[PDB]
Curated annotation (Swiss-Prot):
This is Carbonic anhydrase 2. Changing V118 to A/G/I/L/S: Reduced CO(2) hydrase and p-nitrophenyl acetate esterase activities. The lineage of its organism: Eukaryota, Metazoa, Chordata, Craniata, Vertebrata. It comes from Homo sapiens. Its cofactor is Zn(2+); Co(2+). SUPFAM superfamilies: Carbonic anhydrase. The gene is CA2. GO terms for cellular component: apical part of cell; cytoplasm; cytosol; extracellular exosome; myelin sheath; plasma membrane. The active site is at H61. Target of drugs used in treatments against glaucoma disorder and breast cancer. Keywords: Acetylation, Cell membrane, Cytoplasm, Disease variant, Lyase, Membrane, Metal-binding, Osteopetrosis, Phosphoprotein, Zinc.
Amino acid sequence: HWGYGKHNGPEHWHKDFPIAKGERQSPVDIDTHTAKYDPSLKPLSVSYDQATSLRILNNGHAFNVEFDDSQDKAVLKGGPLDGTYRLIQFNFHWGSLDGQGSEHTVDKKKYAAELHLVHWNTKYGDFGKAVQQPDGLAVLGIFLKVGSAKPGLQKVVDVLDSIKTKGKSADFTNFDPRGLLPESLDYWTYPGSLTTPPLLECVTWIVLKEPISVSSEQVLKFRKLNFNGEGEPEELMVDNWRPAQPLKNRQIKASFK
Ligand SMILES: [Zn+2]
């Protein structure tokens, strides 16, 4: 099975998933001086006031907070998107040290972690069908830097103990994702893919310019999770990020100048 270790890491993925060497793979390095300001990009419209979180789960490669996506409760629209996209989950990627952890990079700078808010295009009916389309998913990427604590993130941090190993899940209702957003919604956008197998090229990436800060104690909790299942030898869940891939003739557009 794939993972992030020496023998099953990102550099090995292409053997089981040849699309790993595709034309629109993610993540990528965002060269701020090469990105084109596009005055036709509309502002992002995030409506998370009716969001219904349900469960938090350690899937062996990261932890996900799942949302009820049976209706238009929490949606994303506007920006470079056409149509309505429903929030299905959010997850993180982090490092073993504060100087690495993010998937995307800005002018080669790596952040301590990267939060992904995953949404699927409703015109396709369900998530499974959406992942098979060029414009099936829209993922909002938010960088995390170490500094002051993020209050809205604490509820997530506190429950990590109960989902330490692979396969564990816990009820996680009434969590408000709005507490994880930065002040500004300025962003960069480019066509890309999922950053973990099956690595499908079905994502419109919307990466926020402004990072949010979390405390050292907060990220330390992420690092206590395990890749392994219960009763197995302990392997700390750290550095679950894929390195930047070649841009290959894609243009990164910016909503700001
Ligand atoms: Zn992710």
